[PDB]
Symmetry: C8
Subunit: 234 residues, 8 copies
C-alpha cells in the first residue's frame, strides 16, 4: 500500500501537448496503473489457487462448500481494493494527471481572456492544448498560463477530497453491516485456514525425518572405502 | 493523530483567485478533511461491529444491556474527536486556509488605502479576490498586498489559539466529571472486553489442535505409496 | 516539557503593524499558550478524577482525609507549573513576542532621533507601530529601524534572565521547606497510590480468569455441530 | 531483483548521434543486459548441476523421474524471469533507451515543422539523428528539439505500462492454473529437496567426528618430545 | 554540565550599543547565568532536604552528628561548582560577552588612530560604544573596526586560559588534600546514604504487600453481584 | 569484490596528452590493477601454503594425492577470477580508461571534419592526442571535442557489455559441467578441510591445558615470600 | 586523548597583529593548554590521594614501601604525558600557532623582496607584524603576503614531524627497557590495586546488609498506627 | 592500518616554492611518516619487552631458545611493514608529494615550450620551482602550468602501481615459502604465547582471592566502634 504512493515520485509525468493525444495519455496514467495493482493484489495472495482449483469444475461436486467459497472470494476482493484506491486519490490531489486531460476543453470566454481575438475554431484546440509544459505556449493572448493552471489544478482537488469521502464512507458501511458477515459461515473460513497451514508444517517434518532414517545407509559407502586409513599420519 | 499534522505538508494548498469560488474552496479544505478523519476513527476501531449487530434490532431484546451500550458508544466517539481536532487547529495556525476564504470581504477604507480610487462596486470583488497568489495582483493601488496578508493571517491565529483553548477546556471538563462515568456501569464494559479477547485466542487453539489430530490420517496416503523405496540409493 | 520549546519553532510569529492591535496580539501570544499548557497539565494526570469525585460532595463525609487531599492537590499543581514556566521564559529570550508589544511606547527623543521633525502626536503611533516587519517602514527619519530593535530586543532578555532567576529561586525555596511536606501526611499519600495501582492490576486478573472458565461451554457448540467430519479427507 | 533497478543509475546512458549506429546502440542497451540477468539467474541457483548431471545422459536410465525433472526445470525458469522483466520495464519508463533508438524514423511533416525546407532525403537522417544530446543540434528549423523529445518520450511510456500489464496478467494466469502444477508430481519435488539438504548437513557431522577420533594420535607426538620440561620454571 | 555549553548556542547575544548600558548588559550575561546554574545544582540533588530539616533547629539536638553535616554540606557545594565553572570559561573564550563590556574604555591614542581628530571628550563614549554591531559605526576615522575587535577579542582569551588554569589548579589541590577528607568521618557519610536508600525500597515493598492482602475483600463485592450469570451464553 | 568497485572512485584518472605515452598509460590502468587483485586473491586464502609445501617436492612421494591437489588448485584459481573480472568490466563502462588509449587512432575523415585542412601527417597525432582533458585542445577545426568523445565513449561500452556477456556465459558453463567436478574426488577435498580445522582447534586446547597445570608451581614462589603479612593492617 | 584534538576546532585562533604581543599570544596558546591537560591528567586518576596521604609524612614510617611508591608515581606520570603530547604536535601541524609567533623575525632580504625600499628599522616590525590576518596588510611592497605564509607555515610542519619522531622514539625506548620495570617491585603494585578495589566493594555489602537488619524496626511504627484499618473499604 | 589512509586527509600538504627546499620538504613528507608508523608498530605490540629482556644479556644463557627468538622477531617485523607500506603507496597515487619534489628537474625543451626564450641557467630553477601553488607563477611563457602538472602527476602514479605490484608480489612470495616457517619451531612459539596469557589471568585470580580473605579482619574495626547503635531510631 505504501509502495503505491512512493512509486509515484519515481514516475516522471509529462504530457505530450497534442490535440487528441492528451485525453488518451492523461486517463491512461489514471486508470491503467490501478488495474495493475488490482491484479497484483491477487498473485501476492496465497488462497488464489484454491479458488481456481475449486471453481474450475463446473459440475457442482465442489469440496469445501457452496457458501464458504462466496465468502472467501468476496473477502479477498476487499483487501485488493486498498492499493488502487490509494493510487487514484493521491494522483488526483496533484492535477498533473488531470490538468492535461481536459485542458483542451475548458471555457476561455468565462474566466480567461475575451471570447475571440482573431483565431478560428480549429486552432483553439491547437493552442489551448499546450497549456501544461510552460516553455512553449503560443497563447499568452488567449489566456494566461498562470491562471488556467489554477482553474484546473483546483477542480482536480475537488474530485480528490470528494473521492476520498465516498471511499471512506463505503469502507465504514461495509465494515459494520451485512455483506456475507454471518457468524456461522465465518467459522468455516477461519477453520479451513489453520488446516491449510499446519498441513504444510506437519508434512515437512515427516519427509525430512524419513530421509534422515534413509540417508545414513548411503554415507557408509563413501566412508570405509577411501583407504580406511589416513596416509598423513605421523 | 500524528499523521494528521504531517499529511498537511504533503497537501499543496493553492486558492483559485475567483470571486465566488474562494469561499467554497476555502471552507472545503477546512471542514471536509476533518469529516474524513472522523469516519476513519470508527473503521479503525474494532467494537464498531458489536454496536451495529446489537443496535440493528429495533425490538428491545438486546443482549448486553440498555446502559452499557450507551457508555461504550459515548466512549468511542470521544477517542475519535482527537484526530479532527488536531486538523482544524493546526490548519488555523497558518492562515492559508483562511486567508483566501474571507479575502473578498475585508474593509479597505479602514486599514488599507483610501475609500475609493475610481472603481465600481463590482470589480472590488474582482480585484480584492486575487490577494493571495502574489504573482498576478492588479490592486496595488487599492491596498498593499504585503499589508492585507498581515491583517488576515493575524486574525486566523486568534481563532487558532481561541479554538485550542475552548477545546482543552472541554477535555479537562469531561475528563473529571459526570458524563456516564459511573462506577457500576464501568465494570461491565471493562469486563465484556476481556470476554471478547480471550474468546478469539481460545478458539484458535482448539481449532488448530483439532486439525493436527485429523491431518495425520491424510499424510499417510501420499507416503508409502510413491514407491516405498528410493531409487537413488547406491 | 521539551515539547514546549520545540513547538515554538513550528509557530510562525508575525505582528500586525497596527496601532492598537499590537498590544493585544503581543500579550496573547505570551499568556494564552501558557494557559493551555496549565490545563493540559491536569488532563494528562490520572489522579484528577479522584479529587472531583471526592471534592464534589459539599457535605464533609469525604473518604480519604481532610488533610491528605490538600497535600495531593498542592502537589499536582506544582508538577504543572513546569510546562508554562518554560514557555514564558524561552519566549522572553527572543524579543519578537515583546518587541511588537511595546514598540508603540518607547521614547524617541531619548535614544532615537530628535524630539520632533514635523509630525503630529497621532501619526507617531501610526509610524512607530510598524517597527517590526522590516519591509514597510515609513519612519527612517524619526528613528533607525536597526537601532530601535536593539533597544527593545535587549530589554526583553533582561526580563528573561530576571524571570528565570526568580523562578529557580522559588523552586529552591519550596523544594527544601514547609509547604505541606510533613512526614506523617506524606506516608498516607504514598500509600493510597499503591492501593489504586494494584487494584486495577488485580481486578483484570480475576475477570479474565472468570471468562476462560466460562467461554469453554460456548465453543463446544460451534464445534461438533458443523458436520463432525471433514469432507476433504482422502 | 532490487539490484536490477539501482544499477541503472550507475550506468550512464549516452547515445552516439550517428545515422546507423543509433538503432544498434539503442536496442543493445535494451536487450543485452536482460540476457545477462537471465543466465545469471541460473548460476545463483543450486539445483542447476543436478539437471546437467541428469540431463547429460541421452540414454533414458535417468534416476529421479521422467516427469519430476520437467517440473523442476519449468519451475526454475520462472524464478529467473523476474530479474529481466524488471529491467525491460523500468528502462522503458524513461525513453532514453528508446528516444535515440527510433529518433531517425519519426515523421516531421505530421507533428513537427513543414514537410520540406530545402534539404535532400539523405541529410534528414543526418540531421534528425542528433535529436538527443541537446548541445549540437543543427535542425532547429526542421523540428524543435523540445517537442520532438516529448513525442518520443511519451510513446515509450505507452509501451512501458502496456508491457507491465501484459506481464502481470501472465503471472496472474500461470500462478493459478495448469502448467505442471499437479498435486502428485509436486510432492516428489518438495521431497527430493530435503534429501539433498540433510545429506550435506549429515555428512559434515560424520567426517568431522571421524577426524577428532584420529587427530589425537598425532598431537601426542609433538608434545612429550620437545623437552618434557619447561626451562623457564623458577 | 554538557548542557551548559550547548545552551550558549541557543542564546543569541547582541549588545545594545549605548554608553552606560553596555557595562550592565555585558556583565549580566557573564554572572547571572552562572548564578542560575549554582542554585540549580542544589534542587537537582536529593540530600538538600535533610540539611534544611536538620539545620533548621537552632537548638543543638541535631540527630546525625555535629561533624558529618559539615562534610556532607562541603561535599555538595563542590559538585555544584562544575556547572558555573564551565559557563564562565567557555563564554570568556569568545569575547562577545567581553568585547562590548569594556569597549567604551580602551585607549585610542595607543594602538588605534591619532590621539585627537576633532571630537570632544563626551562623544568618544558616544562613538566608541558602537564598536560591536558592525553595521552602524560612525567612528571609522577614530579607530578601525577591524583592529579594535582584535585587541579586545584577544584580551578575553587571555583571561580565558588564565581562568581555566587557576580553576584546574584548585581542583587538583582540593582533590588530594585536607579539606574535611578524614577517614573516620567519611565512613559515617557513606553509611547514612545506604540507610536512606534501602529505606525507601523496603518501605514500598511492605505497603504494596499490605494492600494486596486487603484489596481482595473488595473485589468480591463487584463480582458475584452483577447477575452471577452471563446472558450472552448460547 | 565490492572493494574493487569503490576503490575506483578513490583513484583519480587523468591521461597525459602526449603522442606515445597515452597507449602506455591507458592500458596500464586497465591491466595492472587486475594483476594486483589476482595475486592478492591467493595471499588472502589459507590453503596456499599446503600447495607450496606439497608441490615443492619434485619427487612424487606427495602425501595428499595425485588428483586431489589438481582439484584444490583449480578450485582456488576460480574464486580469484571474480575480483579482476569486476575491475576490467566496470572500468570499461566508463571510457576514460579507453577514451585516451586509442584517441590517437580514430579516423577523422569518416565521422569528424573534412579529410585535410592544412596539417602534415605528424601533427595529427600531435593534435588528436589531446582529445581528453578538455581545457587545452588546439584541434577544434579538425574535429569537435564534444563529438569525438561520444564516438569513443560509446565503443567502450560495447566492449563493456560484450565482455560481461562472455564472462557470465563462462561461469554458467563451468558451474554446471565437467571441469574436475567428479563425485569421488570431491569428498576427499571436503574431508581434508575439516581435518585441518579441528586440528588447530584441538591443539590449542591441549597446550593451554598443559600450561595451567604447570604455571601454578611458579606463582607459589612470588607469593608467601613477599612478607607473608600485610603491614597496612589496622 | 581524542578530546584534545577535537577541542582545537572549537577554539577560534586569531593573532593580534601587534609588535610585541604576538610572541606572547603565540607561545601562550602553545604551552598553556598543555599545562592544563597535564594537571588534568592527575585529578582524573584515582591513586593521586594515596601518594599525598603517604608522601605527606616527612618522617619515613611510610606504610606501603620505599620503592613501590617511586614506581607508582613514575607510572602515573607516563600516562599523563599522552594528552599534552597530542596537543603540542597537532597544533604544530597547522602553523597558525607558529605563523604569528615568529612572523616579526624572518628575513626579508633573503626570500622576500629587496633589502630596503625606504622604511626605517622600526616600522619593519610595525609592518611585518601584520602578516597573518590577510585583510589589513600595508606591506605588499616589502614582501608578498602569499609567499611569507608559505615560508613559515612550512617551517612549522618540519618541527611537527621532527617532534612526533622524537616523541615516538622515546615511547619505544622506555616501553622496552629499565626505568623501574623490575619484576619483583611490579607484583607489589599490581597486588595493592586489587586490595583497594575489593575493599570498597566488600565494605558496601556489609553496610547495606547492616541497615536492612535495622530499618525494619522503624517501619513497624508508621504502620499499625495510622488507623489499623482502611476506611475506603466497601 | 586504516588510520594510515584517513590521516592523510587531515594533513594539509603545501610545498614551499623555493629552489633547494622542495627536494627536502618533498621527500620528508614521503619517508618520515613511514618511519613513525614503523616504530609505532612495535610499541603497540606486547612481546617487545620479552625480546629486550632476553636479547639484553650478551652471554648466551638465554632462556627461551636460540631459534625461537629469531622466529618471533622475524614475525613481528612483518606485521609492522603493513602500515608504512600503505602510506608510501597512497601518497604516491596523488603526485602532490612528488609533483613538487622533482618539479625543478624536468626537461622543458622536450615536452614544454621552446629550449630558450631569454633567461639564464640560474633563474630556470628560480622559475620552474614555483610550478605547484598555481597562484604565483611567473613562467607561463617557459611552460604551461596546466601541462607540466600532467607530466609529473602521471609519472607518480606509474611508481604508484609499480610499487604496489612489487609489494604484493613480495607478500605472496614470503606467505608461501621458507623464511623461518618450519613446523617444529612454529609449535614452540605458539605454545609460549598461551603460557604468557593464562599466567596473567591465573595470577589475578589468586591475588584478589588472597585479599578478600584478609580485608575482612579490617572492616570489623570501623564497624562495632562507631556507636554500636543508631541514634536516628524512632
Ligand atoms: C527500489 C526498488 C525499485 C522497485 C521497482 C519499482 C518499479 C516496478 C515496475 C514494474 C514492476 C513489474 C513487475 C512484473 C511482474 C513481476 C512478477 C513476474 O513477472 O513473475 C512472472 C514472470 O514470469 C513470466 O511468466 C513472464 C514471462 C513473459 C516473457 C517476457 C519476456 C522477458 C524478456 C525480455 C524480452 C523483451 C522483448 C520485447 C520488447 C518489448 C511469473 O513468475 P513467478 O515465479 O510465478 O512470479 C511470482 C511473482 N511474485 C513474486 C509476485 C509472487
Ligand atoms: C557497490 C557494489 C558494486 C556492484 C557492481 C555492479 C556492476 C557489476 C558489473 C558486472 C558484473 C560482472 C560479473 C562477472 C560474473 C561474476 C562471476 C564470475 O565471474 O565467476 C567466474 C569467474 O571465473 C571464470 O571462469 C572466468 C575466467 C575468464 C578469464 C577472464 C580474464 C580476466 C583477466 C582480465 C584480462 C582482460 C584482457 C582482455 C581485455 C578485453 C567463475 O568462477 P566461480 O567461482 O564459479 O563464480 C561463482 C559465481 N557466483 C559467485 C555468482 C556464484
Ligand atoms: C578506508 C581504507 C582505505 C583503503 C586503502 C585503499 C588503497 C590500497 C592501496 C594499496 C594497497 C597495498 C597493500 C600492500 C600489500 C599489503 C600486505 C603486505 O604488504 O604484507 C607484507 C608486508 O611485508 C613485506 O614483506 C614487504 C617488505 C618490503 C619492504 C618495503 C619498504 C617499505 C618502507 C618504505 C621505504 C620506501 C623507499 C622507496 C620509495 C620508492 C608481508 O607481511 P605479512 O604479515 O605476511 O602480510 C599479510 C598480508 N595480509 C594481511 C593480506 C594477509
Amino acid at each position: 500500500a505504501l509502495a503505491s504512493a512512493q512509486l509515484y515520485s519515481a514516475f516522471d509525468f509529462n504530457c505530450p501537448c497534442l490535440p487528441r493525444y492528451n485525453l488518451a495519455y492523461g486517463l491512461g496514467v489514471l486508470l491503467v496503473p490501478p488495474l495493475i495493482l488490482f491484479l497484483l493484489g491477487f498473485v501476492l495472495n496465497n488462497n488464489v489457487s484454491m479458488l481456481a482449483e475449486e471453481w474450475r469444475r463446473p459440475q457442482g461436486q465442489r469440496q469445501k462448500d457452496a457458501a464458504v467459497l462466496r465468502y472467501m472470494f468476496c473477502s479477498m476482493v476487499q483487501r485488493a481494493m486498498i492499493a488502487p484506491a490509494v493510487w487514484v486519490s493521491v494522483t488526483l490531489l496533484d492535477g498533473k494527471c488531470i490538468t492535461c486531460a481536459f485542458c483542451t476543453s475548458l471555457p476561455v470566454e468565462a474566466l480567461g481572456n475575451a471570447s475571440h481575438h482573431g483565431l478560428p475554431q480549429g486552432e483553439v484546440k491547437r493552442v489551448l492544448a499546450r497549456i501544461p509544459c510552460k516553455e512553449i505556449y503560443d497563447g499568452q493572448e488567449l489566456i494566461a498560463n498562470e491562471v488556467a493552471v489554477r482553474y484546473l489544478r483546483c477542480i482536480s482537488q475537488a474530485l480528490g477530497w470528494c473521492f476520498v469521502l465516498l471511499m471512506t464512507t463505503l469502507a465504514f458501511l461495509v465494515r459494520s453491516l451485512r455483506p456475507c458477515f454471518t457468524q456461522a459461515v465465518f467459522l468455516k473460513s477461519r477453520y479451513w485456514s489453520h488446516y491449510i497451514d499446519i498441513e504444510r508444517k506437519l508434512f515437512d517434518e515427516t519427509c525430512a525425518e524419513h530421509a534422515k532414517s534413509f540417508a545414513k545407509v548411503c554415507i557408509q559407502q563413501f566412508f570405509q572405502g577411501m583407504s580406511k586409513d589416513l596416509t598423513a599420519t605421523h
